[PDB]
Design a protein around this ligand. Structure first.
Ligand SMILES: [Zn+2]
Ligand SMILES: [Zn+2]
Lengths: 79, 42, 54, 98, 51, 40, 180, 49, 213, 101, 151, 242, 190, 48
RNA sequence: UAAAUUAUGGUCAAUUGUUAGUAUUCAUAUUAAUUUUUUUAAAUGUUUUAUCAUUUUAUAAAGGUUUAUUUUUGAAAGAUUUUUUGUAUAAAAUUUUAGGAAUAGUUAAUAAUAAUUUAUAAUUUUGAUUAGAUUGUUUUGUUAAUGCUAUUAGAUGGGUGUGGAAAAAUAAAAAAAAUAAUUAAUAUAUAUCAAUAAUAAAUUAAAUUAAUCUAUUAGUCAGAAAUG
């Protein structure tokens, strides 16, 4: 929750959609969205997850953090 | 996590009409041997 | 964490209790200090003259 | 002489006692294990001294409890023991009332 | 103390029960014996007995 | 002065019934070994 | 006395003003509107405390019923009641002795109390204001005159001390033989 | 405001001819109390000696 | 106080002279204590100028060991006290099924002991006027100690816990049942050491000393 | 109660019983030897309202404070305000302060 | 003022005290008695009472003298009025015997520590099983949709 | 806007406003349907004056509800016409059969809500026909000639100045009040004998007459009349304290 | 109201019968710390900052608090706190001026314990009597300079050793052997 | 309630996040406490 | 180193999580929230005065502060026939940050002094100065409870030094020097950061004035419930 920076939901900006492989015993090809957002004049990069779905191209993303998933290092998920 | 990602609330039989529909419905043909003298309660 | 919600909807049975609906005695203030209006005066005879003045 | 202590079966109304509106039929309220209920005036026929008072300086534990917690975390069907409530049907069938 | 949103001193002394309109619980024709115990008589904490 | 009413105590467990002694435990109820001198 | 005045909120003079018996009350929904009657100064800061002198009471503008008394067959008692709690004795000390200005809504109330005479602005619209003339005013005083020996008393015991130590029962404070 | 300033005095004949009686009585009681606690200090001074 | 107003009526009308008696009958006896099988000699009262203090004791009972004081070293330590060490002497002895304990001797240590003994948690105690120690004889029942638990009010000395009379009235009130079971020793302002029961029967509260039951 | 009485609590009562004699047998044993104070007599005959009513006629309320109308404060402005004290409500005022309520 | 006073004195209902206008009941700043407020410990006004140890002291109802005061010197007025038990009282009263002993503290105490059990002298009445919504011979009337509990 | 949400005030008669979701729902689902034992008209014997006070055309035309379609306890908000006075309201047969709730103006035909019939305060025709001529023509004057002089009945009348319709209490007109109510003005006769704008004039006549007679207007003349006319014989005066 | 339960709430305007009107402020908010520096680059020298501060005074925690019940209130009755202060006069080198070092009371409610604390004051002494160490009584007045609101109101013990040390000529008190704590290994040889 | 305690309350570990928790440890702990309990008559007699 | 009671005196302390060998405030609960729902707000033109003037009307923009913010009758209340007095700036207690050290118009006395008077001066590890976050001391939340965790908004220099007090460049909802007005609390769609609504959420109806609103999502291995 470091990058949620305390608010309940944080808005960010799509950049890349790369695929990372979950942690064993699990198996998958999990969708890790390398996003960014400017906040408090420094700009930041947020490697996040995607459990939602996408219909229109929208680099508007509502990252709310979640539990742990079979991926090591992704504390943020989509709304 | 979020319950409504990839799909919203499944609206499935939001009125669930099977608990409603009564093609067999007692009518003026209630039995005077099994219904009350009012023919309203069995 | 409280991602669920409240734990009971505490509600109260409305029931009318027979003392509040019991008959109040009234007397409209126009039975103590009667209300009447001044027929118009020469400086302000009309209700357009009035607003022109005010 | 006992007081007329509050939050009885009779004192309380429905939405407090149970968690649905329940008719106040003066005839045959089976859920209060009651058979009939002639309702003469509250304090008319009893002798006067018996009108001891109204005690309610305790918890209405049926209805609201201190430090409410889901009795059994699992399965999710459990609240505090103050959430007694029957089952809500799907779409509500409203008959025509004669 | 006074005329901020959170007035205290008008409750500091004792005022009888105002039942002039529906302040939410049909206060004006609904007479509220049990509503007062459970509801508006202050309490020792949420749910504790009416103090 | 004890505003704990004795008349509103105990938490209801549904149907689970728990015993209560009117005065004294049913063990200590009877005293034959001492009214009838049946003792070492 | 300020370079750029505060426009809706100027009073007459000065930064801490004279004491005034105001009857404020927060504007929210009418059902939730009852009046904090209280002594205080004219020129306040934005809230009702920094020149609050002495909480004086609370008024219910909403007329309530006799749900504290039984159902009388008495009309004036069955009528709705309008209730207020004063601080009668600190009002007397402020108003009477420290001379705080009595505003007009609070006065409209205390008039109904019986402390103060019914105000200037309880105007019976239905009767005209008076017509003064010296001939009739002096002709009356001529007609009915009251004496110096009945007026000086009341002046004294109505604006000055009034516990008349009854000359007879001042005997109880003039000691007896062991020191007399 | 002849009656309104006739009162602003009467409530100095009433608030003072009452503070008179009541400070008289407060001193008649705080004097019993003042004197009694003073006596106890003297007594505990004795027992200390 | 009502059992004396009509027991002190024996005043003659004359304020008569008080009778002289034997050289000494008003002197307090000493409490008996066998000199040969013993913990310490019950030291006499005449030697009342031989008695030193708990902190600085005299030279008496050379035959016997001496308890030491309990004074810590740093900031980081809790500061024990005779009331702490007496409670844990007694706790360890009732845990070892001993009989006599040689327990520190301060005014409120034997204060706690005299009221515990009044409350029956102890078969007896004895002040040998030993400037440092005194002996508490423990009572047992069915194999287990009568002092079920005994706690200090404070595991520290630097923290005195004055008990409000209402605090001490909400112990004898277990959910509506008046309960003088667990006895709490508190030392009032009058330099008396009393249980909470006589402390709240006179509505004074005192320093918290021990809880016991 | 969970008071624990010392082994010989009853000595005071026991000597008072061993010595107290009675003018005759019936004062020795009568059913009101328990009842010592008015609290004892009311807690006994409280159930018995026929006895209580006569015995303790004070709890029976008879008297009260009359409803006493005041004379009213006179106003100098005469009938140009002789309505001004008159509404369709009653107006109840309760004084407060540091001292009252 | 004069014509109003004339009519006011003509009013009989007047000439009564309006205790709102007539006196300032307690003009000082502080109450005439401790009123439910806290105490040194915070024992809020309900958890306490007045007169205990927190009060102002009550002082010795005598004088505290040195050496030759009441130690066999003589006697104060508290020495002739006190009476020995044998000789009668001055004035006769018909004191009860029972209250006499009670007042003295010698009455055989009958407290409520001695009170045995209050037995059910009379069997009350047999408590026949009053039917509930969990005594329905048929699991139909006790559905989830009708019965949420027996009563 | 915003203040649409504000609930309409409820007084000391109004029971349940039914102004929110759950405030109407559990009462919404009561799908009433008229059966022959529901039908009010079956029950004329008991409720004759409930049958005879129905604005039937006003009902059907505006509502789609028939005199036959009316329950004896119909919760529907229909219009009626008072058979005693003749005013029109919108009242449900339920609150009129359960409670005897009716016309907001025949609410007060009886002098005091509390003691309604005990009033031996005399009638209108057998007492004061000079009101019988000014009251608006209703053909119900045959019954209103028994309304008490003390009745708060907001009766409508013919004025004499503007000829129009002015509605005032029968008591506020007649003047007399039943012993022990809130009494009305000393001049309420002279300030409701006319129209709310044409009741001004008959007043200042005697008011300026005295400004002329005396060169001075001071309301104290009625007072001084009462002292120069009514000597108090023996009004008990209290023992002074001074 | 506070004593009411969430769903039993209706009206956040009034409190019907009684109780405590107060704004349920939202303490539960995850206040954060936005790292605007690097663990080796801080614009402070002594106390670096790397996590949220708890802010307030009479609000920090451990909840230190004012306690008047100390040596001073045991010895002197006071009109207003701090008036009278007793200490080892330490430091008088400013001509006619004394530095009196006397303690107050800092009570810790949570622990149920105290610690009284030190403070070098300014204290005027016209005529230069006191020497470092005289246990003195100090009272407050009207101010005497920027920093001295006190004056030497007595002596409770004069350092007679010191006064004679001056009379003989030496320093009434030898000066501390070492300075304040430093960070540099000062290599004093010979 | 299987013992019949009408007025009692047991608390374990101070909170159900405090380990160790397990159905085993819960039953064992409460029964151990009910064993450690001393009667009031036994308390009294123990104090004579 | 004595028991005692004229019998409950002085007013409620009480802890409700399905865990997974064991050690340990530490995922899932409930409470208060936030995420979340338009039933509290709102307008412009301050107003008098003898007149190009003058009388009246003094702490919300930020401004970054932890040894910190403190002050009166002389204005006004405020009453007479005149000259009428001694009550004020000061303080005192509490002050943050992992790894901690030097700081500076300086300290005291003189002084109605010394831009160059006198001096062994003062702040600091009892944590100073710099820099960092931060509104400062009856308002909450949880808890049986010491706690832990909250409360806003208001004072950001002086420079013609006016005024009683600089707080003074627009941001009430105080009647503001003639009773204007209170038959009034209503306020249109405008806003700030306050302010918890799903107010009988489902059969018997609203002694109303008939006013707003058509009312919904969860899971379904553990553990309520599953198959195509
Ligand atoms: Zn009608
Ligand atoms: Zn007309």
């Amino acid at each position: 929750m470091w990058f949620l920076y305390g608010c309940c939901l944080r808005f960010v900006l799509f950049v890349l959609c790369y695929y990372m492989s979950p942690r064993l015993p699990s198996s998958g090809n999990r969708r890790v969205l390398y996003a960014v957002f400017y906040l408090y004049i420094f700009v930041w990069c947020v490697r996040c997850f995607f459990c939602g779905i996408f219909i229109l191209s929208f680099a508007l993303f509502i990252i709310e953090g979640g539990g742990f998933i079979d991926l090591p290092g992704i504390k943020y998920y989509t709304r | 996590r979020y319950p409504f990602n990839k799909r919203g609330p499944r609206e499935r039989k939001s009125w669930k009409h099977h608990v409603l529909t009564d093609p067999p419905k007692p009518i003026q043909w209630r039995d005077p041997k099994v219904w009350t003298k009012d023919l309203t309660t069995m | 964490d409280q991602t669920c919600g409240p734990h009971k909807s505490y509600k109260y049975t409305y029931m009318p209790d027979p003392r509040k609906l019991a008959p109040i005695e009234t007397t409209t203030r126009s039975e103590i200090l009667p209300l009447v209006i001044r027929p118009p005066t020469s400086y302000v005879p009309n209700h357009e003259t009035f607003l022109e003045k005010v | 002489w006992a007081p007329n202590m509050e939050w009885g079966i009779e004192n309380t109304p429905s939405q407090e006692q149970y968690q649905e509106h329940v008719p106040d039929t003066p005839d045959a309220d089976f859920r209060k294990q009651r058979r009939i209920q002639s309702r003469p005036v509250k304090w008319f026929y009893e002798s006067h001294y018996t009108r001891t008072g109204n005690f309610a300086g305790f918890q209405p534990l049926r209805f609201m409890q201190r430090r409410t917690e889901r009795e059994v975390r699992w399965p999710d069907v459990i609240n505090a023991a103050v959430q007694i409530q029957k089952r809500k049907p799907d779409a509500y069938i409203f008959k025509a009332i004669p | 103390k006074v005329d901020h949103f959170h007035a205290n001193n008008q409750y500091q002394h004792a005022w009888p029960l105002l039942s002039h309109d529906d302040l939410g619980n049909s206060d004006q024709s609904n007479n509220t014996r049990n509503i007062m115990y459970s509801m508006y008589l202050p309490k020792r904490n949420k749910g504790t007995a009416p103090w | 002065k004890n505003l704990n009413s004795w008349y509103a105590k105990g938490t209801m467990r549904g149907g689970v019934p728990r015993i209560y002694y009117a005065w004294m435990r049913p063990g200590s109820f009877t005293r034959r070994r001492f009214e009838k001198m049946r003792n070492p | 006395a300020r370079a750029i005045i505060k426009r809706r909120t100027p009073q007459l003079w000065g930064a801490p003003g004279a004491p005034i018996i105001r009857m404020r009350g927060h504007h929210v929904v009418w059902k939730f509107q009852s009046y904090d009657l209280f002594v205080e100064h004219t020129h306040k800061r934005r809230n009702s405390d920094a020149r609050l002198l002495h909480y004086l009471g609370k008024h219910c503008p909403h007329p309530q019923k006799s749900l504290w008394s039984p159902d009388t067959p008495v009309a004036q008692d069955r009528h709705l009641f309008m209730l207020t709690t004063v601080d009668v004795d600190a009002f007397k000390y402020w108003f009477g002795v420290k001379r705080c200005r009595l505003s007009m809504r609070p006065w409209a109330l205390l008039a109904k109390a019986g402390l103060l005479p019914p105000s200037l602005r309880q105007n019976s619209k239905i009767m005209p204001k008076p017509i003064f003339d010296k001939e009739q005013l002096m002709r009356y005083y001529l007609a009915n005159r009251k004496e110096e020996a009945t007026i000086e008393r009341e002046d004294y015991l109505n604006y000055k001390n009034s516990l008349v130590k009854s000359e007879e029962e001042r005997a109880a404070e003039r000691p007896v033989a062991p020191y007399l | 405001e002849a009656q309104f300033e006739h009162l602003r005095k009467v409530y100095k004949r009433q608030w003072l001819e009452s503070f008179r009686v009541n400070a008289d009585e407060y001193i008649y009681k705080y004097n019993i109390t003042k004197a009694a606690q003073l006596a106890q200090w003297e007594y505990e001074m004795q027992a200390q000696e | 106080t009502r059992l004396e107003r009509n027991k002190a009526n024996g005043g003659e009308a004359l304020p008569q002279r008080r009778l002289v008696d034997l050289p000494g009958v008003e002197r307090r006896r000493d409490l008996p204590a066998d000199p040969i099988t013993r913990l310490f000699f019950q030291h006499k009262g005449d030697h009342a100028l031989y008695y030193g203090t708990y902190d600085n004791p005299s030279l008496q009972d050379e035959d016997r060991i001496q308890i030491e004081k309990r004074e810590p070293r740093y900031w980081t330590y809790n500061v024990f006290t005779p009331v702490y060490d007496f409670c844990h002497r007694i706790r360890e002895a009732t845990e070892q099924r001993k009989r006599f304990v040689i327990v520190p001797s301060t005014v409120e240590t034997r204060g706690c002991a005299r009221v515990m003994l009044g409350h029956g948690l102890v078969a007896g105690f004895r002040d040998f006027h030993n400037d440092r120690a005194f002996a508490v004889e423990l009572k047992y029942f069915q194999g287990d100690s009568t002092i079920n638990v005994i706690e200090p009010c404070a595991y520290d000395g630097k923290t005195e816990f004055e008990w409000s009379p209402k605090m001490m009235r909400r112990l004898m009130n277990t959910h509506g049942i008046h309960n003088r079971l667990v006895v709490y020793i508190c030392r009032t302002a009058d330099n008396r050491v009393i249980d909470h029961i006589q402390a709240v029967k006179e509505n004074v509260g005192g320093r918290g000393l021990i809880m016991v039951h | 109660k969970i008071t624990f009485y010392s082994d010989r609590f009853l000595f005071r009562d026991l000597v008072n019983r061993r010595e107290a004699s009675y003018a005759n047998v019936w004062e020795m044993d009568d059913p009101y030897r328990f009842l010592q104070t008015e609290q004892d007599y009311e807690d006994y005959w409280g159930d018995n309202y026929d006895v209580y009513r006569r015995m303790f006629p004070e709890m029976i309320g008879k008297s009260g404070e009359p409803v006493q109308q005041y004379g009213q404060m006179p106003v100098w402005t005469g009938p140009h305000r002789q309505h001004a004290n008159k509404s369709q409500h009653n107006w109840m005022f309760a004084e407060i302060g540091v001292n009252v309520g | 003022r004069d014509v109003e006073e004339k009519r006011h004195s003509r009013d009989v209902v007047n000439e009564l005290p309006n205790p709102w206008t007539d006196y300032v009941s307690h003009a000082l700043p502080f109450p005439d008695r401790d009123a439910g407020y806290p105490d040194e410990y915070g024992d809020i006004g309900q958890w306490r009472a007045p007169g205990g140890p927190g009060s102002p002291v009550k002082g010795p109802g005598y004088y505290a003298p040195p050496m030759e005061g009441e130690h066999q010197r003589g006697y104060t007025a508290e020495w002739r009025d006190l009476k020995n038990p044998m000789r009668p009282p001055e004035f006769p009263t018909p004191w009860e015997r029972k209250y006499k002993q009670y007042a003295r503290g010698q009455h055989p105490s009958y407290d409520m520590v001695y009170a045995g059990p209050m037995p059910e002298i009379f069997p009350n009445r047999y408590d026949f099983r009053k039917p509930t919504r969990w005594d329905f011979h048929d699991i139909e009337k006790q559905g989830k949709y009708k019965t949420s509990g027996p009563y | 806007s915003r203040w649409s949400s504000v609930w309409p005030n409820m007084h000391y008669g109004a029971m349940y406003l039914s102004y929110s979701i759950g405030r109407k729902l559990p009462m919404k689902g009561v799908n009433w349907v008229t059966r022959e034992s529901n039908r009010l008209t079956n029950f004329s014997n008991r409720y004759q004056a409930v049958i005879n006070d129905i604005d039937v055309k006003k009902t059907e035309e505006e509502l789609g509800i028939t005199l036959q379609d009316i329950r004896w306890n119909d919760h529907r908000r229909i219009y009626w016409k008072c058979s005693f006075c003749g005013s029109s309201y919108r009242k449900s047969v339920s609150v009129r059969t359960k409670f005897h709730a009716g016309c907001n103006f025949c609410k007060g035909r009886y002098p005091s809500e509390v003691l309604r019939e005990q009033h031996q305060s005399l009638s209108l025709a057998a007492s004061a026909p000079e009101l019988i001529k000014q009251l608006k023509e209703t053909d119900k004057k045959d019954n209103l000639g028994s309304l008490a002089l003390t009745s708060k009945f907001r009766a409508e009348w013919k004025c004499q100045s503007c000829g129009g319709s002015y509605r005032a209490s029968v008591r506020s007109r007649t003047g007399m009040v039943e012993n022990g109510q809130c009494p009305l003005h000393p001049n309420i006769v002279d300030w409701s004998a006319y129209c709310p704008s044409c009741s001004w004039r008959p007043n200042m006549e005697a008011i300026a007459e005295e400004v002329q007679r005396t060169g001075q207007f001071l309301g104290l003349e009625a007072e001084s009349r009462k002292i120069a006319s009514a000597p108090p014989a023996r009004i008990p005066r209290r023992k002074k304290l001074v | 109201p506070w004593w009411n339960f969430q769903t039993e709430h209706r009206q956040r305007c009034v409190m019907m019968y009684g109780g405590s009107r107060a704004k349920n402020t939202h303490n539960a908010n995850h206040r954060v710390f936005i790292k605007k520096y690097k663990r080796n680059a801080f614009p402070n020298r002594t106390r670096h900052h790397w996590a949220v501060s708890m802010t307030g005074v009479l609000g920090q925690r451990p909840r230190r608090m004012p306690w008047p019940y100390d040596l001073t209130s045991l010895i002197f009755n006071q009109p207003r706190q701090g008036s009278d202060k007793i200490g080892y006069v330490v430091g008088t080198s400013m001509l006619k001026t004394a530095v009196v070092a006397a303690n107050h009371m800092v009570y810790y409610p949570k622990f149920n314990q105290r610690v009284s604390r030190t403070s070098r004051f300014f204290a005027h002494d016209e005529d230069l009597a006191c020497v470092e160490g005289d246990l003195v009584h100090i009272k407050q007045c009207r101010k005497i300079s920027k920093y001295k609101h006190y004056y030497v109101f007595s002596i409770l013990e004069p350092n007679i050793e010191g006064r004679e040390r001056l009379k003989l000529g030496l320093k009434a008190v030898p000066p501390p052997l070492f300075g304040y704590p430093v960070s540099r290994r000062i290599v004093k040889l010979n | 309630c299987a013992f019949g305690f009408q007025h009692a309350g047991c608390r374990i570990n101070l909170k159900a996040t405090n380990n160790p928790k397990s159905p085993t440890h819960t039953v064992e702990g409460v029964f151990e406490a009910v064993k450690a309990l001393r009667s009031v008559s036994e308390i009294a007699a123990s104090r004579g």
